[PDB]
């Protein structure tokens, strides 16, 4: 069952992790912490939402002797993969040089920016050796201004249309002093052919803001397999969606119009009413229970049998049993 406790409608219905709101940097468990560090990163495990802000300062990666905190292992930034919401801001002034993008925040979806850095910024990425932002799932920056600056070899960030992610008027953007626009196109670091003129977070097809044609999975392709293909499919909300295994692959034309085994064009084995099946019902029940048997005629359409023939049948009438 599924019900609501403390403002969240939660149970083990959940796909993936159950939603869990955690505190930001400077409040609560993280009081007096200047940044995400090696001792407090544990307390973000399995968090999906963050009430408040998130700082990743350089202090984090060199350690600190005054507070006896060791430096942070770059590998332990994957703790942040489950986070999908930040009510405050996201400020990054330090990131491992080993790592080329912010793929620890790949599943981040929304920055509410109810509290803003200084007085204006909800997203702040400054002074990193990253080559691409990599915020693939970022769909809304609700209040603050965006500053991405000083990232000497960062590309792609200018392709993004930042007004299509905003939520309030007066919301500006400061993209400044990253890698050169001409230098990015010259090195081949430009949005993939399959992206649309909205931008991208990186080079690969799964990094587009949106797709020019269609999407299969979270990847972003050209054609959906409508007329040809191995697991050919149909298009629903600009998305390739598989076609029920029990519908015969029809050549030259579309093979179905919906997900179910009913709304395809021709069945691959037999038919029971609206649905295409592989086996006519032989011992299915309902209520006022009686086991209903069904025989397939010469044209492989299943019809039910004379009710009194309860131990199976092959022919119609009384003759089968």
């Amino acid at each position, epitope marked *: 069952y599924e019900m609501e406790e403390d403002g969240v409608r939660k149970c083990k219905k959940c796909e993936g992790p159950c939603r869990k709101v955690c505190n930001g940097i400077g409040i609560g468990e993280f009081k007096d912490s200047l940044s995400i560090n090696a001792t407090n990163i544990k307390h973000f495990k399995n968090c999906t939402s963050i009430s408040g802000d998130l700082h990743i300062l350089p202090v984090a990666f060199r350690g600190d002797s005054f507070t006896h905190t060791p430096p942070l292992d770059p590998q332990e930034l994957d703790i942040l993969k489950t986070v999908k919401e930040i009510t405050g801001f996201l400020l990054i002034q330090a990131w491992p040089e080993n790592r080329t993008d912010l793929h620890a925040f790949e599943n981040l979806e929304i920055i509410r920016g109810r509290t803003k850095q200084h007085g204006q910024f909800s997203l702040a990425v400054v002074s990193l050796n990253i080559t691409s932002l990599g915020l693939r799932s970022l769909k809304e920056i609700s209040d603050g201004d965006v500053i991405i600056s000083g990232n000497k070899n960062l590309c792609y960030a200018n392709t993004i249309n930042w007004k299509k992610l905003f939520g309030t008027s007066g919301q500006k953007t400061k993209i400044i002093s990253n890698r050169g626009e001409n230098s990015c196109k010259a090195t081949g670091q430009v949005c993939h052919a399959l992206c649309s003129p909205e931008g991208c977070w990186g080079p690969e097809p799964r990094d587009c803001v949106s797709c020019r044609n269609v999407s299969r999975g979270r990847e972003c392709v050209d054609k959906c397999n409508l007329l040809e293909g191995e697991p050919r499919e149909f298009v629903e909300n600009s998305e390739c969606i598989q076609c029920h295994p029990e519908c015969l692959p029809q050549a030259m034309n579309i093979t179905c119009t919906g997900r179910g085994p009913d709304n395809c064009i021709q069945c691959a084995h037999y038919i029971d*009413g609206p649905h295409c099946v592989k086996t006519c019902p032989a011992g299915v029940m309902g209520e006022n229970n009686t086991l209903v048997w069904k025989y397939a005629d010469a044209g492989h359409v299943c019809h039910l049998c004379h009710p009194n023939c309860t131990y199976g049948c092959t022919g119609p009438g009384l003759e089968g049993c």
Partner: nanobody
Amino acid sequence: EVQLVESGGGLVQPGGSLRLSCTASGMIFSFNVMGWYRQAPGNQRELAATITTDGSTNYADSVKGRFTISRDKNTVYLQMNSLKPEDTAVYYCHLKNIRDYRNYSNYWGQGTQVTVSS
């Protein structure tokens, strides 16, 4: 080929009841299934209840126990009892003219709006 004319629909209050009816005139074949599909805001269209000439019925799991599909010749009736907000949708009459397992055709009505609401 085949046309379908629908009657019924309307709004009710939660827990109330409605009757839907659809009668089909045309080139109708001997083995065929008739019934209703439905689409709520803003989901996909899904089967609600389809009875066949053979009598055997199919229901969505959401509606079993509350919906009753019945057939006389080439007109079908749907008794919708114990109606819930989730049932608010457009209901499409339907007919699947079945010749063979590789040969059938689908016809749809215009769509009747059912809402439930206080």
